[PDB]
């Protein structure tokens with residue numbers, strides 16, 4: 001398992017997120033390394049879920065391919081017969097480095113990002129449900145009366161956010177990134193979410209909502225799908241089997257972890273080591289999401 005990548009300065013670091021380490025490959029290219037870290041209640045666990053980052057990378061690769069005729073994406077085309085390692089400095093093929101990178105890394109074009117978190121919600125839950133119960137709105141948008149918890153919205157909706165996160169209205173998104181650009185990302189995001197939500201539902205997973213990020217290629221005026229796509233870290237995954245309108249749903253991937261944290265008053269606490277049984281049960285859910293959605297065997 002890979003918790004924290006250690007590349008000994010071979011590439012400069014651009015960022016470390018909750019789960020991913022981002023390196024600069026060259027002036028036009030980044031390397032996104034998904035680690036096996038996991039977060040709950042906005043804090044990272046001390047220990048890892050082995051191979052989570054491989055599974056999530058491969059799931060993202062599946063979705064990029066699934067959506068290849070719908071949207072351009074940031075992946076660098078790896079030539080036939082080659083691997084990402086052929087596009088990286090030779091030293092990163094040495095075992096001490098290759099073992100940290102293989103199967104969990106994506107080579108991506110640097111794009112100009114549209115600085116907006118493009119959340120699409122298919123189902124009313126989370127902060128959207130809380131706001132709705134209080135004022136009948138979601139990100140300020142008036143909703144029909146009588147929706148029940150976890151109910152499907154009449155149509156999936158664009159509900160933007162700004163990173164720290166702040167739920168904002170569509171009008172505020174247009175202030176931030178321009179009216180026409182906000183309109184284009186909203187329309188595209190809803191199309192992409194709906195297609196993938198329908199596919200996943202037929203496989204038995206409900207993707208209640210998802211967070212996309214987009215770039216813009218200004219030379220072609222094309223919106224580019226970037227960042228994390230339709231993983232349980234970027235989305236709310238629910239078990240289809242146990243879906244019941246009018247109540248909360250278990251987290252597909254994190255409910256075992258959340259239950260254990262809650263039982264021990266560890267929600268939100270730093271430095272927490274998960275017990276082996278929690279690690280194992282959580283890992284098995286990632287493998288099942290990967291196998292069910294991609295049709296591949298792990």
Ligand SMILES: Nc1ncnc2c1ncn2[C@@H]1O[C@H](COP(=O)(O)OP(=O)(O)OP(=O)(O)O)[C@@H](O)[C@H]1O
Nearest residue numbers: 015016017018019020022074108109110111226227
């Ligand atoms: N193709 C792209 N080109 C340039 N930047 C990108 C591209 N795709 C995503 N990014 C940016 O790269 C970074 C991805 O890092 P990552 O999402 O793993 O961590 P984070 O956003 O800092 O924290 P978090 O774990 O909460 O997402 C983000 O700053 C994201 O907006």
Ligand SMILES: Nc1ncnc2c1ncn2[C@@H]1O[C@H](COP(=O)(O)O)[C@@H](O)[C@H]1O
Nearest residue numbers: 061075076077078079084105106107108
């Ligand atoms: N941009 C990329 N970064 C890292 N791995 C990639 C990338 N593109 C494709 N791959 C991997 O290369 C293999 C062949 O994919 P493809 O190049 O699309 O034919 C797959 O197993 C992918 O996981």
Ligand SMILES: [Mg+2]
Nearest residue numbers: 017018227228
């Ligand atoms: Mg991010």
Ligand SMILES: [Mg+2]
Nearest residue numbers: 060227228229
């Ligand atoms: Mg992803």
